Write a protein that binds this ligand. Structure first.
Ligand code: NA
Ligand code: NA
Ligand code: NA
Ligand code: NA
Lengths: 431, 431
């Protein structure tokens, strides 16, 4: 049957090495017990072997008010932060936050898969009890389970192989000196991994960490890239037959609208998809600069505006609400980030992290439309209704016949003369 | 079993008399054949007997481009239009309008039950073929069927007994000169009518013609009067504790708002229900004067406006679109008759008969609302939505917090200083 190799023999610490911190690892009833300390940094008991593709299993228990984790495909390099342990980590969190089984990129990218991405896994961890963990690291796929509950699922290629390590996190208050985290029955399967892998029917939804790519899961699910992360393929200027020769830069897997005078579509101009879409889920990652303005448009007719300014369509406003003057204009905030520009305001409380990339989601299912920001629904509307047409009649789009009522339209990225970054521009066409 | 009496014996015209016009009635293969003429008015072949409660059955055929009908409980009085045949008539309509089986009040009230009130019955009549008809006139209930399809259902007490007559409608163009209508197998049942009557499960929805009353059907169906047709009971001034002492008159079963300077709620002021309603079907019959303005409001809070003008609520606009200046003042006609005033425009083409009474219907089912005019849906909307709140934010109601979003409110009739008539103010409370 399945060939399992023990990583810990229940007797001694053979096959392990302590890195960074000076916390103790004692053996109590066939379990590795990591003991908290004071004045020492994070400690890691790392395997003396590197593992690429594997199925890892271990039992774990932790004192409340303590944080722990198990490093996967992790490294310690003398050239990077004096051998500080970095890489994927299976979170052990007994706090009310409840992100156990989540993936944290230790001393590197930080949170990759927090349990906000899969909230039903928050109930998996049993406080002050033994918990059974399973990790499946197969190619670029890293998946985690706690007590049979799927927790995290990331698609990433940064480190294909590295060590497994047990974390004893540095403590801050005196009230946690002898507080322990314990690991037992640590075993690994490295032979016939594909024979014993968990099916796609019993996993957490995947998060693809490899910018501007379509994972096998995303492909099976009907996703395609609108931007390939390298070329202007699939895009043209709204009023041009080809891509603009200025005002748009592509570098480091980021599609950047250039900073100019902040004027509307006066630099390189807006860019549109070279094809039309009907029903879809459109996802766009964006990062703004101070006082920046841009937007994601859909139901676009690139031939309507032959004059100055932005091409005609419905818009997912992108803005620095704190600085850009347009945020205070319009009616009851209908020009702030995430709004249906000049029509429907985004709520006052929205999950926006101005220092990082944010994800815009636009869903079109015939007449039904939704705007999401970082997995939270902002607005909901229905075109081809008495309400829609009446609302459009009061707006900036009052002169456009049958505005936002057509089945098909192009998707657009706006030039509002400010520096805005884009990546992971993907589409899932719907029935 | 059922006792049937033939109205036509198949051989001669014994039991019949020709009234008004001079068109011919010939017998062809056991059928009465009415022949169209020229220069003669409508002709009626009337039974020499009067019938009150009965079940009438006949087969009928008509040439296309011709109009006919069968008179029920009808009269011919020397004191009434010099013997002009008047009364209920079963319509025979081969035109695209398709109101065969509908009830028309010949030389009296005109259309009582057009097939606008039961559009599924429009398919019943077979062109250039024989059609079976059934009429059940039982007390105040007059119901009709064509080929087993229920067509019309009226509740009326104007004429409990009269003759049955076959109509040869006066023709205008020479091309109709020869054209005929035929009626065969004309039989009547006057004995044990209740034993053979069609159940309520197989009829057209009823229209009650008896002003300010609740028919047995309406009562069973949960309808009640908001105005009893005689007293101010159930009504008070919007800003008063009692009914206004001026500007509102009750006479002849009509509720009248008096003509003054055309100012908004400056005469007797608006009148409101002394009760609040939640979910309902509200019906109002109204008649306007030239350049008149009024309205039916719902979701009313009589305590919001303590100043000048109309009380606060959503409004079914009542207006003379042709003359009143406010018709040109909205956004894309949102202040014209039937509109949700200043919010949602009624369509450009609406069934409004400015010389007669018209029926306004307002349906509230929690957040969902509809406006109907004379059995035709005008607009439909949903409050407590992003679209609603955004649309309200652009309107005259932009300063009212949570406008039109409350479950309950009073129903109001507007004083807009013009002469407007009301009757049949009824409500069906919903779950
Ligand atoms: Na941790
Ligand atoms: Na914008
Ligand atoms: Na007729
Ligand atoms: Na009005």
């Amino acid at each position: 049957g399945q060939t399992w190799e023990p990583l810990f023999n229940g007797k001694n610490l053979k096959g392990w090495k302590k890195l960074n911190g000076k916390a103790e690892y004692k053996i109590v009833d066939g379990a590795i017990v990591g003991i908290s300390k004071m004045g020492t940094p994070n400690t890691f008991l790392a395997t003396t072997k590197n593992y690429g593709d594997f199925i890892l299993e271990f039992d774990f228990k932790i004192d409340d008010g303590l944080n722990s984790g198990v490093q996967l495909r992790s490294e310690s390099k003398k050239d990077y932060q004096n051998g500080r342990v970095h890489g994927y980590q299976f979170e052990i969190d007994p706090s009310k936050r409840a992100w156990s089984g989540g993936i944290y990129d230790e001393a590197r990218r930080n949170w990759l898969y927090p349990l906000t991405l899969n909230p039903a896994a928050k109930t998996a961890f049993k406080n002050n009890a033994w918990n059974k963990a399973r990790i499946e690291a197969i190619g670029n796929s890293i998946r985690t389970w706690i007590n049979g509950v799927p927790c995290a699922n990331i698609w990433d290629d940064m480190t294909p192989s590295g060590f497994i390590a047990l974390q004893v996190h540095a403590i801050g208050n005196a009230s946690e000196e002898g507080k322990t985290v314990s690991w037992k029955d640590i075993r690994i399967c490295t032979t016939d991994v594909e024979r014993y892998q968990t099916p796609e029917t019993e996993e957490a939804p995947e998060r693809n960490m490899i910018a501007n790519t379509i994972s096998p899961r995303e492909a099976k699910e009907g996703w395609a890239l609108l931007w390939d992360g390298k070329t202007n393929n699939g895009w043209r200027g709204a009023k041009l037959n080809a891509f603009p020769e200025k005002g748009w830069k592509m570098e480091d897997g980021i599609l950047k609208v250039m900073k100019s005078g902040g004027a509307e579509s006066a630099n390189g101009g807006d860019i549109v998809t070279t094809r039309k879409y009907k029903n879809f889920i459109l996802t766009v990652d964006f990062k703004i600069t101070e006082g920046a303005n841009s937007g994601v448009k859909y139901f676009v007719n690139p031939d309507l505006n032959k004059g100055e300014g932005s091409a005609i369509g419905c818009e997912f406003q992108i803005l620095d609400d704190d600085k850009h003057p347009d945020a205070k204009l319009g009616v009851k905030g209908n020009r702030k980030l995430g709004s249906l520009y000049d029509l429907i305001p985004a709520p006052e409380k929205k999950p926006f992290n101005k220092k990082d990339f944010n994800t815009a989601t636009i869903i079109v299912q015939d007449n039904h439309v939704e705007h999401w920001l970082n997995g939270v629904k902002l607005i909901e509307y229905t075109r081809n209704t008495d309400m829609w047409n009446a609302l459009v009649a009061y707006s900036k789009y009052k002169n456009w016949p049958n505005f936002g009522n057509s089945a098909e339209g192009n998707i657009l990225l706006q030039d509002h003369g400010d520096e805005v970054w884009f990546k992971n521009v993907k589409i899932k066409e719907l029935k």
